């Protein structure tokens, strides 16, 4: 239904070990499709999804130039922020940026995004109006002044409402057999005694795509949010994801527990119980 495109940039300084490394990766929903690493033997934008391979040489050269140029700009930016915070030239720091567009279930731009962080803390972000900024502190205020003077917001709005959506729609069509295919989770419940009067019920969700999913345990129809151990959704390595939720229950009360699964690929929500 809904879709998004995001580029994630990571620029990391490393005093004494060369110039800052710049890495960029591009995603359509939960599928990465391109990468660029300034540390590669030969820095170039490279395909990471089959459907992007059909793009011509001009695409790959244009992208490589963009990322090569960003490599230099982000190095300047790291020097600038080091200064804004009166930091030593001896520490390592990181600037991260993520931007992209969200489309609704009809193909129209739902909203745009452009956020930056410094050493893992929000630094500056383009507001939802795509015309104003929110700076985290007086340092970010300096960056804001620069960007307004350079009309950066206008450049982002043009991109987000234009090129971003146009190319996302192109990718969705070229890779429709995968990007527009939701794979439902294969589910089951396992039972692991932990003592004579308690056992662990673990609800599994495997092989699903996209990553968005909801796993919950109910006791007599009541959600066990506080007593449920939910691991982070993890990649299987074949594009799909895995996840599980576990709850320790009193031996003999297993049937009072039900696992509920919600995922875009399921013809209908699932309700499972342990089956001895």
């Amino acid at each position: 239904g809904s879709h998004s495109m995001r580029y994630f940039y990571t620029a990391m300084s490393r005093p004494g070990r060369g110039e800052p490394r710049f890495i960029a990766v591009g995603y359509v929903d939960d599928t990465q499709f391109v990468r660029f690493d300034s540390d590669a033997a030969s820095p170039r934008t490279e395909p990471r999804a089959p459907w992007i391979e059909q793009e011509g040489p001009e695409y790959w050269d244009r992208n490589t130039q963009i990322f090569k140029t960003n490599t230099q700009t982000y190095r300047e930016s790291l020097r600038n922020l080091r200064g804004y915070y009166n930091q030593s030239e001896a520490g390592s720091h990181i600037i991260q940026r993520m931007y992209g567009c969200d489309l609704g279930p009809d193909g129209r731009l739902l909203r745009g995004h452009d956020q930056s962080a410094y050493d893992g803390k929000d630094y500056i972000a383009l507001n939802e109006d795509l015309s104003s900024w929110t700076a985290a502190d007086t340092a970010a205020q300096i960056t804001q002044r620069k960007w307004e003077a350079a009309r950066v917001a206008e450049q982002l709005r043009a991109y987000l409402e234009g090129l971003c959506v146009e190319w996302l729609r192109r990718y969705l069509e070229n890779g429709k057999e995968t990007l527009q295919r939701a794979d439902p989770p294969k589910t089951h419940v396992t039972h692991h005694p932990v003592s004579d009067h308690e056992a662990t019920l673990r609800c599994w969700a495997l092989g699903f795509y996209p990553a968005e999913i909801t796993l919950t345990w109910q006791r007599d129809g009541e959600d066990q949010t506080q007593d449920t151990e939910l691991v982070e959704t993890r990649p299987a390595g074949d594009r799909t994801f895995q996840k599980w939720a576990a709850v320790v229950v009193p031996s003999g009360e297993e049937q009072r527990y039900t696992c509920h699964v919600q995922h875009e690929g399921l013809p209908k929500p699932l309700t499972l119980r342990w089956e001895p």
Binding site: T10, I23, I94, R202, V231, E232, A236, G237
Partner: protein, 99 residues
């Protein structure tokens, strides 16, 4: 300022002794991005282990998937050894085919 990595060791497909599979070590929620990850077989570092391209989550924490082909058995023991600036010493996480 710094966030320690969450670590999960698991297989791509359901574990079946004698059947080729993929051993995964997914590290996430960490910051900064520098991190050392080795997959172990009975304590010995496995050679030729690949990893995903560096990316991060909405909260800015990084995540990476390290993986390699392997064939589970009854005796062989597998694990993931992770070191990060947030860790005093490398953390060892053993593979449990039920996790």
């Amino acid at each position: 300022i710094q966030r320690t990595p969450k670590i999960q060791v698991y297989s791509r497909h359901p574990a079946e002794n004698g059947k080729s599979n993929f051993l995964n070590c997914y590290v996430s929620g960490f910051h900064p991005s520098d991190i050392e990850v080795d997959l172990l077989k009975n304590g010995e570092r496995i050679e030729k282990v690949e990893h995903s391209d560096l990316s991060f989550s909405k909260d800015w924490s990084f995540y990476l998937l390290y993986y390699t082909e392997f064939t589970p058995t009854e005796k062989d023991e597998y694990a993931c050894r992770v070191n990060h600036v947030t860790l005093s010493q490398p953390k060892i996480v053993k593979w449990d085919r039920d996790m």
